[PDB]
Design a protein around this ligand. Sequence first.
Ligand SMILES: O=C(c1cc(Cc2n[nH]c(=O)c3ccccc23)ccc1F)N1CCN(C(=O)C2CC2)CC1
Length: 357
Amino acid sequence: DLGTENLYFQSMDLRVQELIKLICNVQAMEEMMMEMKYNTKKAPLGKLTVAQIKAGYQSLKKIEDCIRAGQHGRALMEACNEFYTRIPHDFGLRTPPLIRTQKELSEKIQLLEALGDIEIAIKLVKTELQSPEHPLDQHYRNLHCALRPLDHESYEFKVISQYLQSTHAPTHSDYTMTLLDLFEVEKDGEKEAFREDLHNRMLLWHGSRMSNWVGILSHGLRIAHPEAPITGYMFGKGIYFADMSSKSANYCFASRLKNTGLLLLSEVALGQCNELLEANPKAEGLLQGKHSTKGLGKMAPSSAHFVTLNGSTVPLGPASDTGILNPDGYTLNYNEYIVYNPNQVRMRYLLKVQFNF
Ligand SMILES: O=C(c1cc(Cc2n[nH]c(=O)c3ccccc23)ccc1F)N1CCN(C(=O)C2CC2)CC1
């Protein structure tokens, strides 16, 4: 009876144990990378180094350069086939495909960010064979990030549940989400680094792949690699947030097969927003004193329904029309918020979500 054993040994809380086991699962990372077409046979994850990953970003940048110069053939070939040599893919018998659009570049970046976090993960979960500490306690300490499970009958749980449900977007109707459990997050250093002074502090969503949480929790949400192609970033190399739960939960890349994902809530010090109506990867240089970028959506939660939780505005839904319509092109469906310094972020809650397909 695991409840009794836990109580006599006074071991880590069982809910934390299950969370740690889930995010530190190396087999799950192997499966995820195989689904991303990375060749785990030819370049095992255990032998991945950060120099290897950086050389990938570098080849990706050369690919970006080719696309930018309208060059296809020799310079590109030298570029694309060279990326693939550095970051082995498994295309079976098929011609390895060219990388030629923004979105193909984006997919490769997501692959390299994931690899980066797995490289962190595999190091983090190294245990001392002879230590008297349970392996999970060793992993948890190495995160340098407190995770405390919350009472489901609490007010904190009720509001986060309403946030989750009420801001599930109408266009993301392929699944619903069931909140399985909720943890408070306290990452070492974040409270003292945080820009408390800035106005417009909101509690906002961030979704990521299951492979990435060990990285995110141990190192924080980070500014993208300097050598990553800028075109991979709709509003530049910042930290991206949604006020709609499902816009962020789409970035969990959950599926019917792997229906358990995590969502992060963080306090985000937006300060004054520079509001933009469409994509600009150079958005960071447009701030000119302002503190964040707001990519303006067609539908957003409205202020009439906001609530505040320990000093951060929680933008409860439902979402309604914003009167915003780019005349120049394709407007966003929902908002996104970007900050360009980790000191504008304080992680606060981690939700374990079941996706109902
Ligand atoms: O926030 C993003 C990010 C996410 C996305 C996709 C995304 N992912 N997840 C979301 O919840 C989200 C919300 C609104 C808009 C986009 C998203 C796109 C570009 C980005 F720079 N980061 C890039 C990846 N991150 C990292 O720590 C890796 C190491 C650099 C965290 C910060």
